Design a protein around this ligand. Structure first.
Ligand SMILES: [Mg+2]
Ligand SMILES: [Mg+2]
Lengths: 199, 188
């Protein structure tokens, strides 16, 4: 056809344009993904695009607002006239305030039972350790941890999701040769000689 | 053809500032393959830039979702049914006054004045039914003479329009030199 890497990139863009549902909360990340032309960058922003699908998909199913702009909890409450300072820097995947209860959502994907459970406890405990600062605000914390075992989500048909991840794999397991060829360049050796001059 | 669609793609991606209000329209534009659709979305995209500048100059919110006056009010708690389907380029409900913004581009004084009166009458004919509901209409018509907007350098703005223009003149294909020579010759 062929499939030399620039055509992989091309097929990823067609998948993004033809088979990722046109939800406004993906517009920004779709645009950042379509804007890339270097292979490791296309790979990075493709992975970030697929993660936004899962996070937003999670926020919808959990009945709160996807944290579109990665606000902190302190920011979410400071945005609603509720002064709570002295709280960890926590950025939830979703949130929703009612009337004095604050739903906070963390979601994730793990592929083995051991890592699933371990991750579930970690995010449970991350949310639990601010329950009391919120109590003196005084707002009730409603922690939600949404663990998933795969990458299915409602903005991608399953076949396109799989083909997208499959092209991403070919893109990584290829640009894992361009950086290896890079380590024999000279510009690599000239980088190597660049640090010794500053460090 | 394709190199025109390709360099248009790169202007959109690299030389239109990444204000998120443009994101959706940029993406509809980037998804078009055929000249006709590239042209309409191209023009819509230039218009969105201009509407968004107007909203920002006029102190009101850009009508991103193409909401209706009907909708804008019910979202602020004003039940006022029976209004014609009017969809502004901008809006801002403020106390009990509804700022409605109509934004446009024209390039001759004659067609500028015409389109100005039209958008004036467009909003004015819902003034009374807003007064029934309490809200006083604040109608703003902002007409422009060109496509200058704050999201593109001027050279890019010109190159985009020059590229869209060549799609427009391409849509020709002689064609009319064979009209009756088979077409107007069917129900004959
Ligand atoms: Mg309009
Ligand atoms: Mg208008």
């Amino acid at each position: 056809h062929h499939h030399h890497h620039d055509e992989i990139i091309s097929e990823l863009r067609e998948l993004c344009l033809n088979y990722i549902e046109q939800d406004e909360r993906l517009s920004r990340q779709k645009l950042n993904f379509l804007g890339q032309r270097e292979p490791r960058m296309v790979l990075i922003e493709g992975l970030k695009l697929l993660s936004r699908c899962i996070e937003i998909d999670s926020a919808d199913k959990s009945g709160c607002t996807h944290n579109h702009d990665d606000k902190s909890v302190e920011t979410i409450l400071v945005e609603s006239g509720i002064v709570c300072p002295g709280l960890p820097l926590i950025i939830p995947d979703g949130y929703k305030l009612i009337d004095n209860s604050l739903i906070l959502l963390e979601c994730f994907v793990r592929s083995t039972p051991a890592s699933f459970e371990k991750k579930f406890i970690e995010d449970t405990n991350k949310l639990a350790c601010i329950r009391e600062d919120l109590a003196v605000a005084g707002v009730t914390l409603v922690p939600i941890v949404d663990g998933r075992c795969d990458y299915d989500n409602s903005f991608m048909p399953e076949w396109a999701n799989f083909k997208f991840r499959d092209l991403l794999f070919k893109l990584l397991e290829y640009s894992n040769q361009d950086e290896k060829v890079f380590e024999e360049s000279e510009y690599f050796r000239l980088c190597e000689s660049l640090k010794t001059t500053i460090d």
